[PDB]
Amino acid sequence: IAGITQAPTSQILAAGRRMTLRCTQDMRHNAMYWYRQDLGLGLRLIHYSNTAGTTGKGEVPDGYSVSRANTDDFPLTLASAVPSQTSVYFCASSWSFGTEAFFGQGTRLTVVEDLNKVFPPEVAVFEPSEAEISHTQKATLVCLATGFYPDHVELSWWVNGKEVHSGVCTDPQPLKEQPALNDSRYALSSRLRVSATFWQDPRNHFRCQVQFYGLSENDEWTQDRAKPVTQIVSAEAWGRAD
Amino acid sequence: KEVEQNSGPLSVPEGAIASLNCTYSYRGSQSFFWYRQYSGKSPELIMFIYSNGDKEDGRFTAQLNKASQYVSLLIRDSQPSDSATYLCAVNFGGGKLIFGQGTELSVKPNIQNPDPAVYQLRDSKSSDKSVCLFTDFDSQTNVSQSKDSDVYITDKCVLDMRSMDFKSNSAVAWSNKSDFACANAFNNSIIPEDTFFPS
Amino acid sequence: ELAGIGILTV
Amino acid sequence: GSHSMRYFFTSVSRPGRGEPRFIAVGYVDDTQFVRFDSDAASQRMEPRAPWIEQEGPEYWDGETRKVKAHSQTHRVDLGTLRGYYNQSEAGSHTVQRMYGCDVGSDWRFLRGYHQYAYDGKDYIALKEDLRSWTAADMAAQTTKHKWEAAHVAEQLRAYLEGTCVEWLRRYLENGKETLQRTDAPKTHMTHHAVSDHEATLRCWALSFYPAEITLTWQRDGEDQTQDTELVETRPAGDGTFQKWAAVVVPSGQEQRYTCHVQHEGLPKPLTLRWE
Amino acid sequence: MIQRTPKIQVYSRHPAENGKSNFLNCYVSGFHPSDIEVDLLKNGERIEKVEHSDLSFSKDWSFYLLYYTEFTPTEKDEYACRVNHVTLSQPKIVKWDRDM
C-alpha cells in the first residue's frame, strides 16, 4: 500500500558531523516538504519541492541542503550539525502544490557536542499500597525511568507477557532532573491501576518496559562504561496476596 | 509568513462543543488545512477547505471566511480522545505550506467519584527509594511542582479502566534520600478537603 | 490571481 | 457589461539542448495586466497595467511561486506527453493552458473554464459543469483517470467559482479608470477603384474599447454574407483596437450599400454611406 | 503535427500624418508553432528599435504577437513587415499601405 517513509526514526549526532535524513514516497506525488518541530514553535517549513527536479527555500532553509533527483525521494541534509538543530523532523508530500500534505512518521534528532553525555534509563517498579487496597479496592503500580539523556524514551506496560492499554497513564513529556544545569538527564513516570483481586493474585506478572534510543552500533565509544545504545530496560513486580 | 492560532493550552469539558480558530495574512491564500497531532506522533489530516462557507465531517465542522482571513474548527460532542494538539496550515503559493503554532487541547474527564487521597508506595529493587502517589482528585484540583530542586512531582494524568467503567487522575512524587513525607508533598498547591492520609 | 490549487501534472 | 479574467500559459520544449521556454500572461477582459517570462532576467511575475502595481509584496511573491509552480508542472508535462505519444526527443513541442472566469453585468459568476492543448490541439478540457472532463484522445484518458482520482476538478471549481470571480471584482474596482471605460469607435470610409467598372469600398472602425464590435454590410438594407472581406480585430498598441470591413462592388451604385457599426460605447448603431 | 501560417497586418497606431510622430505596427496572428521572426523595414532596411507584446493565444490555440516601433511618416518613406515562420520557404513581406 502506497505511503511515505522516513529513516531513521531516531538519531543522536556529534556536533560538526554531517547527516542525511531519507524520505521516500510511492504515491506518485509531485510535491514534497521538510519541516521541523520544536517543543513550542509548531512546524516550520525548511525546504520544499513542487515537482521532481526542482526545489525551494521555506521559512528556515538556513542550515540544511536538499535534493530532488526524482519523484520518489527527497533527502534532507545537514552539513555542520549545530546543537540548535535538535528538533523533530517531518517529511510530508502532496499530489500537487496546494493540496493536502501527508506526513511521514517523523525523526527525533538530538545534536550534542559530546557523546559521553548520553545515558540509558534506570527503571524501577513501585508496588501499590495496602492503604489504597483497603480504601478504594484498586491497586496502583508506578514505574520510574531515571537518569537518561536524551529523552528518546518509550514506556509500556506488560501483564503476563501481554501489553495493556487500560488503567495506564504516562507523563506526556519527560521531566528534567536538573531544570537549569546543561545537558541534564531526564525522568519519566507511569501509573498502572488494576483491581484488588488482580493485584492480589500472586500468579500475575507486571513489567514496566522502557525502549530507549541511543547510539548507533557503529559509533566510537571510548569511556569506561558500556555503550549507551538503543536498548530495552525493564523492571518487574509480581503479585502479592498479602 | 504569518499563520496564527489560538494560544493554548485550552481545556474543554467532555461532551461539550470545542472551538479553534486560525488567522492568516495572505489574502490570496486558496487552501486551508486542519491537522490533529497526538504527543510524539505525526500530524494527521482532520480536514481541508477551499471555499467560503461550511464543511461538515461527522463531529467536525470547518468554517472558512476569505474576506476575514479566517478558518475555524468546531468539534461537536467532545470525546476525551480529541485531547491532542491542533494544527492550522495554509498555503501561501507553491510549495509554501505554512503551519500555525498549534493549539493544545485537553478534554477533562468527568470524575464520577472524587475521593482525594495520598498514598505511599515502597520499592522492589530494595525498599527505601521512596515514592508518594496522589489519586482520585476531581478535575477541579491542579498540581504544582515548586519544592526543592530535589523533589519531583509530575503533572496530573488520567487513566481509564474500561472493564470497570472507572476513571482516575493521579500525580506521582519522589526524591530518593530524604525525610520526604506524604503530608508534605502536595502542599505547594494546597491539597483538597477530605485528603485521606494512612498512618 | 493565479490558481493555487488544481494544477496537476498530466 | 459582462467581464472576464483569463490566464494563458505557453510551454515550449527546445530539444537537442535544454531549458524550455515558458510564457504566462494574464488578462482582465481585453487588457493584459501581468506576465511571466522564463527567458527574462527577473524570474518574477511582472506588472503590465498601471493598477496592478499598487499590490503588495505578498501578492507578487505569491503569484511568482504559483507561476513557477505552473512552469515546473508544464516541464514535467513535456517529458510525459513525449512519452505518451512515442515522439523522439529531437523535436520541439508545445503545451498550452488557458483558464479563467466570466461574470455578468452585476459581476456575479457566469461561467468557468480550464483547457489544455498539446502541439496546438485539444488534449483535456474541464467541462462547463466543472465536475467532469473531455479527453480528446486515447492517450488523454490516462491523464483523465489520474485527474479524477486526484479530485482536480473540485479544486478547479473552487478556484473558478470563488477566487477567480472575487479577484476579478477586486481588479475591476481597483482598475476602475482603465477597465470600466468604453471608447466609442471613430469611424470613416475609403473608396479605391479596382477595374474601371469596379471599386472596393471599406468601412473603418478605430480607437474603440473593448475589442468586441460588429461591422456589417448591407445593400438596400439586405444581408451580405456573400461578397464580404472581414479582417480580425487588431490592437492599436495604445489600449484600443482597430478593425475594418470591405466589399467589392460594380461602379455606380456606391449609394446602394451601407455599413453598420455596433459597439457598446455607442448610444445607437452607426450606419454610414458615401457622400 | 499541425502547422499554421501567420496572418500579417501592417498599419499605424494613429492615422498617418507627415511630420507627426506615430507608431508602425505589424500584427502577426493565427500561427503555429510559436517560433517566429518579425522585422520592421524602412526603405527595405531593418529597423533596430522594435518592441513586441508578450506571446498569447486565441480560442483555437493559434498564437498572436504585435511588433511595433516609433516612427515619423514622410511622403517618400516606405515601410514594411517581414515575417519568417517554419511554414514559409522564404520571408514574407507586406508593405504598409496608408491609403487602405
Coordinates of N, CA and C in Angstrom, one line a residue, chain A residues 99-189:
Chain A
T99 N -2.4 21.2 -2.3 CA -3.4 20.1 -1.8 C -2.8 19.5 -0.6
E100 N -3.6 18.6 0.1 CA -3.3 18.1 1.4 C -2.0 17.4 1.5
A101 N -1.2 17.7 2.5 CA 0.1 17.1 2.7 C 0.0 15.9 3.6
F102 N 0.6 14.7 3.2 CA 0.6 13.5 4.0 C 1.9 13.3 4.7
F103 N 1.9 13.3 6.0 CA 3.2 13.2 6.8 C 3.7 11.8 7.0
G104 N 5.0 11.7 7.1 CA 5.7 10.5 7.5 C 5.8 10.4 9.0
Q105 N 6.4 9.4 9.5 CA 6.3 9.1 10.9 C 7.2 10.1 11.8
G106 N 8.1 10.7 11.2 CA 8.9 11.7 11.9 C 10.3 11.2 12.3
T107 N 11.2 12.1 12.6 CA 12.6 11.7 13.1 C 13.0 12.6 14.2
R108 N 13.3 11.9 15.4 CA 13.8 12.7 16.5 C 15.3 12.8 16.4
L109 N 15.8 14.0 16.3 CA 17.2 14.2 16.2 C 17.8 15.1 17.2
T110 N 18.8 14.6 18.0 CA 19.4 15.4 19.0 C 20.9 15.6 18.7
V111 N 21.3 16.9 18.6 CA 22.7 17.2 18.4 C 23.4 17.6 19.7
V112 N 24.5 16.8 20.0 CA 25.3 17.1 21.2 C 26.7 17.2 20.9
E113 N 27.5 18.0 21.6 CA 28.9 18.3 21.3 C 29.7 17.0 21.7
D114 N 29.2 16.2 22.6 CA 29.9 15.2 23.3 C 29.0 14.0 23.4
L115 N 29.5 12.8 23.1 CA 28.7 11.6 23.1 C 28.8 10.9 24.5
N116 N 29.7 11.4 25.3 CA 29.9 10.9 26.7 C 28.7 11.4 27.6
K117 N 27.9 12.3 27.1 CA 26.8 12.9 27.9 C 25.5 12.1 27.6
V118 N 25.5 11.0 26.9 CA 24.4 10.2 26.6 C 24.2 9.1 27.7
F119 N 23.0 8.8 28.1 CA 22.8 7.8 29.2 C 21.4 7.1 29.1
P120 N 21.5 5.7 29.4 CA 20.3 4.9 29.4 C 19.4 5.2 30.6
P121 N 18.2 4.7 30.6 CA 17.3 4.8 31.8 C 17.5 3.7 32.8
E122 N 17.5 4.1 34.1 CA 17.3 3.1 35.1 C 15.8 3.0 35.3
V123 N 15.4 1.8 35.5 CA 13.9 1.6 35.6 C 13.6 0.9 36.9
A124 N 12.7 1.4 37.7 CA 12.2 0.8 38.9 C 10.7 0.7 38.9
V125 N 10.2 -0.3 39.6 CA 8.8 -0.5 39.8 C 8.5 -0.4 41.3
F126 N 7.3 0.3 41.6 CA 6.9 0.5 42.9 C 5.5 -0.1 43.1
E127 N 5.5 -1.1 44.1 CA 4.3 -1.8 44.4 C 3.3 -1.1 45.2
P128 N 2.0 -1.3 44.9 CA 0.9 -0.5 45.5 C 0.8 -0.5 47.0
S129 N 0.0 0.4 47.5 CA -0.2 0.5 49.0 C -1.3 -0.5 49.5
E130 N -1.1 -0.9 50.8 CA -2.2 -1.6 51.4 C -3.3 -0.7 51.7
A131 N -3.0 0.6 52.0 CA -4.0 1.6 52.3 C -4.9 1.8 51.1
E132 N -4.3 1.9 49.9 CA -5.1 2.0 48.6 C -6.0 0.9 48.4
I133 N -5.5 -0.3 48.7 CA -6.3 -1.5 48.5 C -7.5 -1.6 49.6
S134 N -7.2 -1.1 50.8 CA -8.2 -1.1 51.8 C -9.0 0.2 51.9
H135 N -8.9 1.0 50.8 CA -9.7 2.3 50.7 C -10.5 2.3 49.5
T136 N -10.0 2.0 48.3 CA -10.7 2.1 47.1 C -10.7 0.8 46.3
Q137 N -10.2 -0.3 46.9 CA -10.1 -1.6 46.3 C -9.4 -1.6 44.9
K138 N -8.6 -0.6 44.7 CA -7.8 -0.6 43.4 C -6.3 -0.6 43.8
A139 N -5.4 -0.9 42.9 CA -4.0 -1.1 43.2 C -3.2 -0.4 42.1
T140 N -2.4 0.5 42.5 CA -1.6 1.3 41.5 C -0.1 1.0 41.7
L141 N 0.4 0.4 40.6 CA 1.9 0.2 40.5 C 2.4 1.4 39.8
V142 N 3.5 2.0 40.2 CA 4.1 3.0 39.4 C 5.5 2.7 39.0
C143 N 5.9 3.1 37.7 CA 7.2 2.9 37.2 C 7.9 4.2 37.0
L144 N 9.2 4.2 37.4 CA 10.1 5.3 37.1 C 11.3 5.0 36.3
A145 N 11.4 5.8 35.2 CA 12.6 5.8 34.4 C 13.5 7.0 34.7
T146 N 14.7 6.8 35.0 CA 15.5 7.9 35.6 C 16.9 8.0 35.0
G147 N 17.5 9.2 34.9 CA 18.8 9.4 34.6 C 19.2 9.1 33.1
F148 N 18.4 9.6 32.2 CA 18.6 9.3 30.8 C 18.7 10.6 29.9
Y149 N 19.6 10.6 29.0 CA 19.8 11.7 28.1 C 20.1 11.1 26.7
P150 N 19.4 11.5 25.7 CA 18.3 12.5 25.7 C 17.0 11.8 26.0
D151 N 15.9 12.5 25.7 CA 14.6 12.0 26.0 C 14.0 11.0 24.9
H152 N 14.9 10.2 24.4 CA 14.4 9.2 23.4 C 13.9 8.0 24.0
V153 N 12.7 8.1 24.6 CA 12.2 7.0 25.5 C 10.7 6.7 25.3
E154 N 10.4 5.4 25.3 CA 9.1 4.9 25.0 C 8.7 3.9 26.1
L155 N 7.7 4.2 26.9 CA 7.3 3.3 28.0 C 6.0 2.6 27.8
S156 N 6.0 1.3 28.2 CA 4.8 0.5 28.1 C 4.7 -0.6 29.2
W157 N 3.4 -1.0 29.4 CA 3.1 -1.9 30.5 C 2.7 -3.3 30.0
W158 N 3.4 -4.3 30.6 CA 3.2 -5.7 30.2 C 2.7 -6.6 31.3
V159 N 1.5 -7.1 31.2 CA 1.0 -8.1 32.2 C 1.0 -9.5 31.6
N160 N 1.8 -10.4 32.3 CA 1.9 -11.8 31.9 C 2.3 -11.9 30.4
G161 N 3.2 -11.1 30.0 CA 3.8 -11.1 28.7 C 2.9 -10.5 27.6
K162 N 1.8 -9.8 28.1 CA 0.9 -9.1 27.2 C 0.7 -7.6 27.5
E163 N 1.0 -6.8 26.5 CA 0.9 -5.4 26.7 C -0.6 -4.9 27.0
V164 N -0.7 -3.9 27.9 CA -2.0 -3.4 28.2 C -2.1 -1.9 27.8
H165 N -3.3 -1.4 27.5 CA -3.6 0.0 27.2 C -4.7 0.5 28.1
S166 N -5.0 -0.2 29.1 CA -6.1 0.2 30.0 C -5.6 0.3 31.4
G167 N -6.1 1.3 32.2 CA -5.7 1.6 33.5 C -4.3 2.1 33.6
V168 N -3.8 2.6 32.5 CA -2.4 3.1 32.4 C -2.3 4.5 32.0
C169 N -1.4 5.3 32.6 CA -1.1 6.6 32.1 C 0.3 7.0 32.3
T170 N 0.9 7.7 31.3 CA 2.3 8.1 31.3 C 2.4 9.6 31.1
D171 N 3.4 10.2 31.8 CA 3.7 11.6 31.5 C 3.9 11.9 30.1
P172 N 3.2 12.8 29.5 CA 3.3 13.1 28.1 C 4.7 13.5 27.7
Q173 N 5.4 14.2 28.6 CA 6.8 14.5 28.3 C 7.6 14.4 29.6
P174 N 8.8 13.8 29.4 CA 9.9 13.6 30.5 C 10.1 14.9 31.3
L175 N 10.8 14.7 32.4 CA 10.8 15.8 33.4 C 12.3 16.0 33.9
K176 N 12.9 17.0 33.4 CA 14.3 17.3 33.7 C 14.7 17.1 35.2
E177 N 15.8 16.4 35.5 CA 16.3 16.2 36.8 C 16.9 17.4 37.4
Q178 N 17.6 18.2 36.6 CA 18.1 19.5 36.9 C 17.7 20.5 35.9
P179 N 16.5 21.2 36.2 CA 15.9 22.1 35.2 C 16.7 23.5 35.1
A180 N 18.0 23.4 35.0 CA 18.9 24.5 34.9 C 20.2 24.1 34.3
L181 N 20.8 23.1 35.0 CA 22.1 22.5 34.5 C 22.0 22.0 33.1
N182 N 23.0 22.3 32.3 CA 23.0 22.0 30.9 C 23.1 20.5 30.7
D183 N 22.7 20.0 29.5 CA 22.8 18.5 29.2 C 22.2 17.6 30.3
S184 N 21.3 18.2 31.1 CA 20.7 17.5 32.2 C 19.9 16.2 31.7
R185 N 19.8 15.3 32.6 CA 19.2 14.0 32.3 C 17.8 14.0 32.7
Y186 N 17.0 13.1 32.2 CA 15.5 13.2 32.3 C 14.9 12.0 33.2
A187 N 13.6 12.2 33.5 CA 12.9 11.2 34.2 C 11.5 11.0 33.7
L188 N 11.0 9.8 33.7 CA 9.6 9.5 33.3 C 8.8 8.6 34.3
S189 N 7.6 9.0 34.6 CA 6.8 8.2 35.5 C 5.6 7.6 34.8

